[PDB]
Amino acid sequence: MKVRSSVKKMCDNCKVVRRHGRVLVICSNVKHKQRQG
Amino acid sequence: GKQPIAVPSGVTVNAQDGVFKVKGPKGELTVPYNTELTVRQDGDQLLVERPSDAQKHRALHGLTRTLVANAVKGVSDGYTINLELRGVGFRAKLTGKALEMNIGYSHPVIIEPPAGVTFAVPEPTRIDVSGIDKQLVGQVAANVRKVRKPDAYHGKGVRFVGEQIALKAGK
Amino acid sequence: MKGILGTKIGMTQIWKNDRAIPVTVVLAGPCPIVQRKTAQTDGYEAVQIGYAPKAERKVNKPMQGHFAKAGVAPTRILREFRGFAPDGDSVNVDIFAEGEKIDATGTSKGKGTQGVMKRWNFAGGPASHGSKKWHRRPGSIGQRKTPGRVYKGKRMAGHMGMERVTVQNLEVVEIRAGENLILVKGAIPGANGGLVVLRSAAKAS
Amino acid sequence: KTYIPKNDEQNWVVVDASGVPLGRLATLIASRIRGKHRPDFTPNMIQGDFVVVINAAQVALTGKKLDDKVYTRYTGYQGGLKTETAREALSKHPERVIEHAVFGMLPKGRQGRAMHTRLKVYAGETHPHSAQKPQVLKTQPL
RNA sequence: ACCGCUGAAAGCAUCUAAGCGGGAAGCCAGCCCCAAGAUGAGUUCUCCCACUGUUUAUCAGGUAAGACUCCCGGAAGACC
RNA sequence: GAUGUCGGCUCGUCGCAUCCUGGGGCUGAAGAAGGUCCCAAGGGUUGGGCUGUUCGCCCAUUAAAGCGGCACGCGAGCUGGGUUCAGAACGUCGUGAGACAGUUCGGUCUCUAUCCGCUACGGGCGCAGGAGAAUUGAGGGGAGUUGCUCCUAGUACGAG
RNA sequence: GCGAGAGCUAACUUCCGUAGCCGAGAGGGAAACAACCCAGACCAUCAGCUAAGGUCCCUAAAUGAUCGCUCAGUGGUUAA
């Protein structure tokens, strides 16, 4: 999991989602797994 | 936006109040919704209409329909998911209705189906969770798919037959 | 739950097979039943047993009635036990069984007013390299202009002992009914002649 | 020259807390207690009727009854005596959720305290009516 | 934290905005000890019971149940 | 018309930007062992040698051998090794008296606690009779650690 | 506060210019509080209108009216 302040796409997958007051990043690949929190 | 509504024979809706009550051949099922969420049957088919249209609304909208349409194929055809046990010595037996895992753990894993679910096993290497409520089934085949996820090097443990599990591949 | 009153009596040596074991000989005399509390009278379920006897010439008038209210015979000690019952009077026969683990609960021998080295261990200090705070005396009570006081609970001298205590899970080694005698492994609280209460494991392994 | 006091009065009202927004309700309770449309309407001492609340357990909040509403409570020398609970967490004692949100909207002085005395909540309903043998003018909120 | 079921708004997809579940030496309960001066001062069992004193001595005074005083002790304790 | 100074010792308690134990994502993660980011402060965090030390280096261990705060926590609590009195010495500066980035041996650290606070223990009164005794539990406190061996299994895994 | 030097366009920092206030200023407001905001106390009065500020309850006064904005507790501690 990657908690980064600046969260953005990293390939034509990265699906920026919004679960409980948080900005997430689900990509078909994992190393792209992001999350401001 | 969603509107079509196949309400085949077996059914029996009862929009009485907010408890959009239902009854079919598989067993009377009940699903609540939003009151200001406008819906009932017109002519033959059915439809859930809506007041305002943009978000706070068109969402519950696209929710309810999908939801009721479920109770349909619900009491109409009943639901059943098919799981796959995979890996060396992985195997499920049973006990009454109790799903019985056997997946590498120093001691066996027993799983018990809740109030309206049923376990079945063909070859102690394939599984099945049938039932009435589309949710629970999913909401439980999960609990079974969880007793052991597939690994990134051999994709073992329970999975979804036509499951796509590529392998990292190590040494 | 279950339980009965008793008197400590002393410890001694005893071999169970080839392993000598120290044991605290307790006497849990037969106990009377002088009042059944029920979550319908006292709002809660429980029992009142009695212990040592007492001459009626000592027995207050009111106390007589309470005991007479069950026709028992003035004891001199009464104690409650939650969620218990039986019919008649409570003895250890059948109650505790050889092998059961129990929680003996007497009253610690009273140590009077004790320092910190003794009541809380502390460490006092020196004994030779400069002093006036030889061994005992606590070091410092706090910090400075912050928490310009001392905390609530700081350990300091005080009356040590004379407190209720409970030493859990004791193995009832032997049991001599016909003598309301019982033998427990290990040491029970308080001194001989003291009232000890033996119950079932408060919560055991 | 201004008016004086009375006494031989003790209006015994019974407000209902059901579904109503705790706060609002509270303010109301806190109102009458201290002095509503007031008799001699005076400071010195209280003439503010006696309040009986039923239910309580079914009072009402909004976004937070899990989040935000955290009734804190710091015991002994605060050697980490930081004890707090979610309001929903006050399902053990709804009774206090109210009772302890009103003693706030009430003077805090000598008299002030003697004023929680007249507030008298009950987590129930009809059963509560038992601890109720005097008047009972049910003056619900609004 | 993290993993999820059913799933719209974006006819797909989504742990989610309706909803539902799993989940930490931590939190609350649980264990042992204190505890109604919890002045909102609780509960239960038992005992003693309704004395005397004329607007001149308006309330105290015999007493019940019970207890203190005091004596002799104590595994209780500085004194209490 | 005085807020005692470095370091120890004693006594603790708090934050988390967690040192170890707990849970988790990703790993270039086979397993075992690790890296790293997230959540998480319940509790725990060893004994020696050198130095006044803090620090740090080192011996032997450990699950670990956290970092900081509280007048660089704590002298009406102890020490007094350190350094900012009087003696004396060396080097150095000064014609000198004296001086010092310095170094070195020596050198009285004040029985009596009033208010708050704190630990124990009593007396009063109160709790709508006067008494004996048995309790409910509002609330509050204490405790909350970790290794190793065995078993499963020489399995899963792995060319081994 | 405004205009500059200094200083890290740091400090209840420092030095000038300039206006106001405290100093020599009570009263209302700003929870509390020199100088910020309103306003300058001759004494007496259970009389009245207003400023800055305010009008759920702790306090005096519309939980006011109408059209909107945000579900964060933003409101009730900063930024790329």
From Swiss-Prot, chain A:
Keywords linked to the UniProt accession: Metal-binding, Ribonucleoprotein, Ribosomal protein, RNA-binding, rRNA-binding, Zinc
InterPro entries listed in its UniProt record: Ribosomal_bL36, Ribosomal_bL36_sp
Keyword Metal-binding listed: yes
UniProt cofactor(s): Zn(2+)
Residues noted as binding Zn(2+) in the record, renumbered to the chain: C11, C14, C27, H32
Cofactor, how bound (note): Binds 1 zinc ion per subunit.
Superkingdom per UniProt: Bacteria
One of the GO biological process terms: translation
Gene Ontology cellular-component terms listed: cytoplasm; ribonucleoprotein complex; ribosome
Annotated PROSITE patterns: RIBOSOMAL_L36
A UniProt-annotated Pfam family: Ribosomal_L36
MF-aspect GO terms: metal ion binding; rRNA binding; structural constituent of ribosome
UniProt cross-references to NCBIfam families, sorted A to Z: rpmJ_bact
Family statement drawn from the similarity comment of this UniProt entry: Belongs to the bacterial ribosomal protein bL36 family.
Record's subunit section: Part of the 50S ribosomal subunit.
Role according to the record: Binds the 23S rRNA.
Protein name: Large ribosomal subunit protein bL36
Gene (UniProt): rpmJ
Swiss-Prot record, chain B:
Listed Gene3D superfamilies: Ribosomal protein L6, alpha-beta domain
Keyword Acetylation found: no
GO terms, molecular function: rRNA binding; structural constituent of ribosome
Alphabetic keyword roster: Ribonucleoprotein, Ribosomal protein, RNA-binding, rRNA-binding
GO biological process, one term: cytoplasmic translation
Record flagged with keyword Membrane: no
InterPro entries linked: Ribosomal_uL6-like, Ribosomal_uL6-like_a/b-dom_sf, Ribosomal_uL6_a/b-dom, Ribosomal_uL6_bac-type
A GO cellular component entry from the record: cytosolic large ribosomal subunit
Any Pfam family hit: Ribosomal_L6
Family membership: Belongs to the universal ribosomal protein uL6 family.
Subunit structure: Part of the 50S ribosomal subunit.
Job description of the protein: It is located near the subunit interface in the base of the L7/L12 stalk, and near the tRNA binding site of the peptidyltransferase center. This protein binds to the 23S rRNA, and is important in its secondary structure.
Name this protein carries in UniProt: Large ribosomal subunit protein uL6
Organism taxonomic ancestry: Bacteria, Thermotogati, Deinococcota, Deinococci, Deinococcales
Gene name per UniProt: rplF
Curated annotation (Swiss-Prot), chain C:
Gene Ontology MF: a single term: rRNA binding
GO biological process, one term: translation
Subunit structure: Part of the 50S ribosomal subunit. Forms a cluster with proteins L14 and L19. Also contacts proteins L13 and L17.
GO CC terms, sorted: cytosolic large ribosomal subunit
HAMAP family listed in its UniProt record: Ribosomal_uL3_B
Keyword Protease listed: no
Protein name per UniProt: Large ribosomal subunit protein uL3
Annotated region described as Disordered, given as residue ranges: 125-148
InterPro entries reported for this sequence: Ribosomal_uL3, Ribosomal_uL3_bac/org-type, Ribosomal_uL3_CS, Transl_B-barrel_sf
Homology family: Belongs to the universal ribosomal protein uL3 family.
Organism encoding this protein: Deinococcus radiodurans (strain ATCC 13939 / DSM 20539 / JCM 16871 / CCUG 27074 / LMG 4051 / NBRC 15346 / NCIMB 9279 / VKM B-1422 / R1)
Swiss-Prot record, chain D:
Region Disordered: start-end pairs: 124-142
GO terms under cellular component: cytosolic large ribosomal subunit; ribosome
GO biological process terms on file: negative regulation of translation; translation
Coiled-coil positions: none
UniProt KW keywords: Ribonucleoprotein, Ribosomal protein, RNA-binding, rRNA-binding
Record bears the keyword Ribonucleoprotein: yes
One function term, GO molecular function aspect: mRNA binding
Domain of life: Bacteria
Subunit structure: Part of the 50S ribosomal subunit. Contacts proteins L3 and L20.
Protein function: This protein is one of the early assembly proteins of the 50S ribosomal subunit. Binds to the 23S rRNA.
Family: Belongs to the universal ribosomal protein uL13 family.
Designated name of the protein: Large ribosomal subunit protein uL13
Organism listed in the record: Deinococcus radiodurans (strain ATCC 13939 / DSM 20539 / JCM 16871 / CCUG 27074 / LMG 4051 / NBRC 15346 / NCIMB 9279 / VKM B-1422 / R1)
